[PDB]
Design an enzyme around this catalytic site. Structure first.
Site, PDB file in Angstrom:
ATOM      1  N   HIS A   6      39.880  33.443  25.593  1.00 35.21           N
ATOM      2  CA  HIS A   6      40.232  34.216  26.775  1.00 35.21           C
ATOM      3  C   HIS A   6      41.707  34.572  26.717  1.00 35.21           C
ATOM      4  CE1 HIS A   6      36.617  33.822  29.422  1.00 35.21           C
ATOM      5  NE2 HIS A   6      36.397  32.772  28.654  1.00 35.21           N
ATOM      6  N   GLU A  10      44.069  34.703  29.067  1.00 40.32           N
ATOM      7  CA  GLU A  10      44.904  33.680  29.731  1.00 40.32           C
ATOM      8  C   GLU A  10      45.168  32.422  28.902  1.00 40.32           C
ATOM      9  OE1 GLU A  10      42.185  35.127  30.520  1.00 40.32           O
ATOM     10  OE2 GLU A  10      41.911  35.371  32.693  1.00 40.32           O
ATOM     11  N   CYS A  59      38.615  33.168  34.798  1.00 44.55           N
ATOM     12  CA  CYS A  59      37.561  32.162  34.905  1.00 44.55           C
ATOM     13  C   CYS A  59      38.213  30.849  35.304  1.00 44.55           C
ATOM     14  CB  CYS A  59      36.786  32.015  33.589  1.00 44.55           C
ATOM     15  SG  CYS A  59      37.539  30.905  32.377  1.00 44.55           S
ATOM     16  N   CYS A 111      40.481  28.843  32.740  1.00 40.85           N
ATOM     17  CA  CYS A 111      41.770  29.504  32.611  1.00 40.85           C
ATOM     18  C   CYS A 111      42.649  29.278  33.828  1.00 40.85           C
ATOM     19  CB  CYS A 111      41.612  30.992  32.392  1.00 40.85           C
ATOM     20  SG  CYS A 111      41.057  31.404  30.759  1.00 40.85           S
TER      21      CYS A 111
HETATM   22 ZN   LIG Z   1      39.121  32.598  31.413  1.00 40.48          ZN
END
Ligand SMILES: [Zn+2]
Ligand code: NA
Ligand code: NA
Ligand code: NA
Ligand code: NA
Ligand SMILES: [Zn+2]
EC number: 3.5.4.35
Lengths: 277, 278
Positions: A44, A46, A67, A70
């Site tokens: 991801h 982040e 999410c 993260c």
């Molecule tokens: Zn995430």
């Protein structure tokens, strides 16, 4: 619109139109300016941001709702603020608000300003469906390509141009891709381009002779579309130029019933050309 | 935390603290400081605001997610920007954003949190991708439909499931609705289900024989998707069950080159069934 949080002020249109938006993207801000950016891959955005840069005390701008994993990493890393677009299933905002982090979800009333790809391998064109958007079409496209093992930069409405979605294939064969797309997007115009870049006139001549001319079945006809004037200023200017190169080499033209059409797309400095039978 | 939109700057904590919170409340801003305030009763706060005051070019702060009816009225009255707290099911923000109104959510509290619809007439899906979000697709679907005199009940991302938008048509003919959706949004997967409910297997068998079997052209196959397990635990468990109901009465499976595909959606207790040709 601008948001003031955690010691800085972040201007939304500027940041948007300044980060890549090929996938979900996270940008690290300090003094309101971008000092880092990461793009989602298997990881991801982040998460890459937190481990590859120092985010403590700063503000993070993300192109979707973070999410939960993260949000946790961002908060634990000591981010002070997060500004995000209101897209996605992610629940991290709600965790962030409960973790001392200032959070804001923005919805710009203007197009995001996606960038045109650097190498226009495939161009997709569609019209007259007022409720459908470039981002919808780019969504399908993204799903199919990645679904089938492909890697691509996909740009809907580049330069806020409507009816357009641009594809650059970084992994796999572009012509396998158009085949795929042709199959699924029945009513859309799909176009393959064999060369595409910011060329001098000299460079473009050499490129046409190298990669385009040998693929020609006489007679031909050049069809040019000027999406943004730059390298050329009108369809005919580019038709005459590209036509002359070939016709002087010397291929034959017939505009009424050609066996091969030489396609040209012009977006500012970017020239793309392909051949269709 | 302040926010600058439509020329104003709004100091979130200050405003929030000046507005009553008994119910959903809307406040008209200038400067931006509060100049009017209306509270929800039988009527939505935003409707009272627009109806009782001049919001043109102004900014509005709402204590929940505005609904689509409120967004329409806000927009079509010249509002220029909207700040709202992150709670409720309202989809109006997405409508506003596509109407030239700047909009921001502050203090995100809880997700939309939509339930699966009672009767899945139409399912619009799409896959993982970074460009789209379900609530925007649903806002657009809702305008499409209501635009042509259909009425529906829409549920983006029920149980927060991804790439999923559920439609229960409540006025007009479902098939006409799917015709319209397929022309006007030809890039999404759109499935019509002829039956949809919470059934015991006996009732399901009955329903299948009444509404599904008569429209099959042999041979057929069954393709089911489990969005969440319940009435059926797996794709194959659903396909085997529905296959047998249809063979048990003379229909013929191919599964190689079906002339008819029997679609199934399972989401907890709720099974839906449809038929697609070729
Ligand atoms: Zn995430
Ligand atoms: Na840009
Ligand atoms: Na092939
Ligand atoms: Na193929
Ligand atoms: Na679907
Ligand atoms: Zn409302």
């Amino acid at each position: 619109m601008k948001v003031s949080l955690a010691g800085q002020t972040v201007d939304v249109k500027k940041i948007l139109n300044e980060i890549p938006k090929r996938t979900v993207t996270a940008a690290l801000l300090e003094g309101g300016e971008i000092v880092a950016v990461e793009e989602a891959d298997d990881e991801h955005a982040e998460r890459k941001l937190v481990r590859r840069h120092d985010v403590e005390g700063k503000v993070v701008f993300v192109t979707a709702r973070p999410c939960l994993y993260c949000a946790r990493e961002l908060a634990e890393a000591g981010v002070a603020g997060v500004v995000y677009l209101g897209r996605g299933r992610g629940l991290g905002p709600y965790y962030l608000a409960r973790s001392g982090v200032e959070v804001v979800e923005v919805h710009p009333d203007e197009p995001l300003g996606y960038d045109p790809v650097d190498r226009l391998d495939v161009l997709l064109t569609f019209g007259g469906n007022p409720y459908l958007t470039e981002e919808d079409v780019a969504a399908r496209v993204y799903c199919l390509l990645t679904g089938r093992g492909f890697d691509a930069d996909i740009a809907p409405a580049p330069e806020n141009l409507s009816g357009r979605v641009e594809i650059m294939v970084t992994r796999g064969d572009p012509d396998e891709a158009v085949e795929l797309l042709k199959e699924e997007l029945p009513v859309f115009r799909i176009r393959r381009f064999l060369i595409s870049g910011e060329f001098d006139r000299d460079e473009l001549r050499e490129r046409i002779l190298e990669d385009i001319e040998p693929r020609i079945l006489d007679p031909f006809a050049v069809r040019a579309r000027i999406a943004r004037a730059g390298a050329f200023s009108s369809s005919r200017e580019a038709e005459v130029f590209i036509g002359d190169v070939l016709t002087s080499v010397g291929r034959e033209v017939n505009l009424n019933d050609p066996r091969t059409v030489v396609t040209v797309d012009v977006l500012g400095p970017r020239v793309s050309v392909g051949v269709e039978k």
